[PDB]
carbonic anhydrase II (Homo sapiens), 258 residues
Amino acid sequence: HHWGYGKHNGPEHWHKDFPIAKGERQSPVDIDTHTAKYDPSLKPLSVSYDQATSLRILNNGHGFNVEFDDSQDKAVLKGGPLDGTYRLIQFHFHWGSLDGQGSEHTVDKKKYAAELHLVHWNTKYGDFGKAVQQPDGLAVLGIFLKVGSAKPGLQKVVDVLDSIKTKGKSADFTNFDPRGLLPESLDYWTYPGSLTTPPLLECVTWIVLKEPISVSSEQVLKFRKLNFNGEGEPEELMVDNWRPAQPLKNRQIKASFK
Ligand SMILES: [Zn+2]
């Protein structure tokens, strides 16, 4: 039936409804740090989030999204391997039922507790809908989360989860600053890939940050209390909403650092 992360509707079943699941540039992938090619041509990333305007937080049945006003160049990403300006539209996380799993991408086979994705679309295309149809339509910034000390900037998000426990629930979520989720360093790996949830379109330039951010176990615990189900239905906890690593195939991962 509808895609999900369960035994009968999980990742291994997706290809039946979305054949692209078996495509040539699918994500996520395992980052082999020894075979990644350091590229001197890669410029530094430019993250301009000081004018960012968040509007709402929503439980979509497979995770939660924090949405932003993308009607103007308020929160943009440029530089790095990107040509042009990319507007922030929303961010979401992927996590596990246990601290030893949860991330989509892995580094030398290592899995992190969760992975944050900041989705941006190329302004040359006019709207998100047109952008996903292009090979250079999206730019997604991936950040790993490890369990350790608490991330002060994540608490606002953690506190509002009670309000959107079930599928379809949404809440006002204004004045949230995404800068508080960024690691100290901006060194990264980059490769051409896809969305990790259906429709799985191959329109993404992935920018995966080397440095993980730390969050407390109490913080990730609250993520695990969300529900996949709608109100009044049998409770199914939202855990392990991650897709496993796909074949790299004809692709080379480049590093911005040595
Ligand atoms: Zn994602």
In short: Residues 217-223 form the longest helix (7 residues). DSSP finds three helices and 15 strands in the chain. The first strand starts at residue 30 and ends at 31. Residues 92, 94, 117, 196 surround zinc ion (CB under 6 Å).
